[PDB]
Amino acid sequence: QKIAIVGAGLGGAAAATLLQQAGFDVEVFEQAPAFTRLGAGIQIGPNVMKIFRRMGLEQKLELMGSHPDFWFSRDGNTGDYLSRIPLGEFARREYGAAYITIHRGDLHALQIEAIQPGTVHFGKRLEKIVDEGDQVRLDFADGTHTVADIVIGADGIHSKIREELLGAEAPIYSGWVAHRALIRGVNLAQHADVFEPCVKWWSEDRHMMVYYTTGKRDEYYFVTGVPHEAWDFQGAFVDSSQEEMRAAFEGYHPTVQKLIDATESITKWPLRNRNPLPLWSRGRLVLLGDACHPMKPHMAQGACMAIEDAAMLTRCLQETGLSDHRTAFALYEANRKERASQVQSVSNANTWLYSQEDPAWVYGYDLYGQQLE
Numbered sequence: 390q391k392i393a394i395v396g397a398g399l400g401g402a403a404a405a406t407l408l409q410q411a412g413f414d415v416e417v418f419e420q421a422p423a424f425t426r427l428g429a430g431i432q433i434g435p436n437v438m439k440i441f442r443r444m445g446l447e448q449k450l451e452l453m454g455s456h457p458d459f460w461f462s463r464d465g466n467t468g469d470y471l472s473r474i475p476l477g478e479f480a481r482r483e484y485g486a487a488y489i490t491i492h493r494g495d496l497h498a499l500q501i502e503a504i505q506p507g508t509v510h511f512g513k514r515l516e517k518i519v520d521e522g523d524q525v526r527l528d529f530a531d532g533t534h535t536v537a538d539i540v541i542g543a544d545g546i547h548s549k550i551r552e553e554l555l556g557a558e559a560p561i562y563s564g565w566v567a568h569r570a571l572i573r574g575v576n577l578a579q580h581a582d583v584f585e586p587c588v589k590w591w592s593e594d595r596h597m598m599v600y601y602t603t604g605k606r607d608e609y610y611f612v613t614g615v616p617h618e619a620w621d622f623q624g625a626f627v628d629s630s631q632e633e634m635r636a637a638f639e640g641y642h643p644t645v646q647k648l649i650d651a652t653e654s655i656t657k658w659p660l661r662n663r664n665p666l667p668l669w670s671r672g673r674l675v676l677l678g679d680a681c682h683p684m685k686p687h688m689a690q691g692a693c694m695a696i697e698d699a700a701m702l703t704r705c706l707q708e709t710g711l712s713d714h715r716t717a718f719a720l721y722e723a724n725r726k727e728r729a730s731q732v733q734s735v736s737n738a739n740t741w742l743y744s745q746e747d748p749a750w751v752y753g754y755d756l757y758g759q760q761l762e
């Protein structure tokens with residue numbers, strides 16, 4: 390009884406670690422020819438820190454990442470504080486875990502290192518997947534192939550598993566864009582007094598989220614959401630420039646302007662205008678994360694949902710075993726579709742932490758306390 394996970398992202402590697410720790414025989418196949426530390430920040434709330442606790446990674450992750458005392462929502466133009474969401478020691482006491490902001494590449498690397506060695510394969514690009522009935526044949530672009538009893542679809546937004554299941558999918562134009570940059574140097578130390586640990590700068594049609602990536606506060610990361618022309622480039626990221634960011638964020642608070650001046654290299658990433666409806670499973674194939682329920686990143690919860698899917702899916706396979714995968718896949722959708730729908734409608738309103746609201750329904754969620762029924 391073997392599980393084949395397609396895709397070694399944050400979601401797939403989390404499923405690999407959790408399912409292997411539960412006793413299952415899991416192998417992962419990643420299309421990237423090598424592993425890359427992404428070189429960006431990521432936010433990890435207490436609800437997912439509890440999943441990292443089950444992997445034995447929470448204590449370690451608390452050592453690298455930055456622990457912001459507050460989430461500040463600030464008006465981009467005036468700098469007025471729209472919300473001051475208490476985290477820090479309050480988050481630990483009220484939600485049972487810490488709210489951390491951390492280097493995504495170092496988290497991604499530590500996650501894959503938690504998988505049993507010799508079971509993660511790079512350069513394995515899935516081209517064809519055939520549900521033979523009793524088993525599934527996976528065909529890779531390098532000519533090699535494998536077989537497993539179930540396949541986990543963790544191939545992200547451009548999931549080949551969703552494609553072979555539902556078809557080519559209609560084209561989605563990219564009308565928005567996301568600038569990203571890591572800031573180190575004396576440019577950070579010169580303005581460190583005005584650089585807050587975790588703050589989102591809002592305006593009328595754009596935003597900039599900024600936070601530190603380590604506990605040492607020696608690295609500062611921002612990620613934006615700006616209207617943009619239709620993305621028709623050969624790559625998933627193009628090099629931006631200070632002139633582009635200055636024009637995009639004209640009128641913003643001097644702190645935001647200082648941030649743009651402090652950069653050395655800025656990359657630009659396209660964002661989809663729309664996403665398809667969730668597809669949880671069909672036959673022996675089961676999906677998680679962006680492959681299952683692609684969403685707008687307005688809530689900074691996508692990867693957290695991918696790991697939550699991995700945790701809930703493991704709880705369901707532990708209850709039924711691979712011999713009864715259909716019941717496991719049904720129990721996994723039934724125990725996740727309401728939470729995923731709630732996150733979907735909040736990113737739809739694009740209002741997450743704009744004003745002073747109670748984030749307990751996200752951070753205080755107990756994935757392991759839920760009854761599967």
Ligand SMILES: Cc1cc2nc3c(=O)[nH]c(=O)nc-3n(C[C@H](O)[C@H](O)[C@H](O)COP(=O)(O)OP(=O)(O)OC[C@H]3O[C@@H](n4cnc5c(N)ncnc54)[C@H](O)[C@@H]3O)c2cc1C
Pocket residue numbers: 395396397398399400401418419420421430431432433513514515516543544545546547548549567612677678679680686689690691692693694695
């Ligand atoms: C601007 C922005 C900011 C975000 N901020 C946050 C945040 O603060 N917090 C948060 O929790 N989430 C955040 N997210 C969401 C997060 O980036 C994604 O939701 C998350 O990466 C989804 O994980 P995944 O494993 O499902 O897919 P991915 O992370 O995309 O991983 C998929 C993997 O599968 C591989 N793959 C793809 N196709 C194949 C194939 N055919 N064969 C083999 N391998 C394949 C890919 O190479 C990749 O390694 C943000 C997203 C954006 C766009």
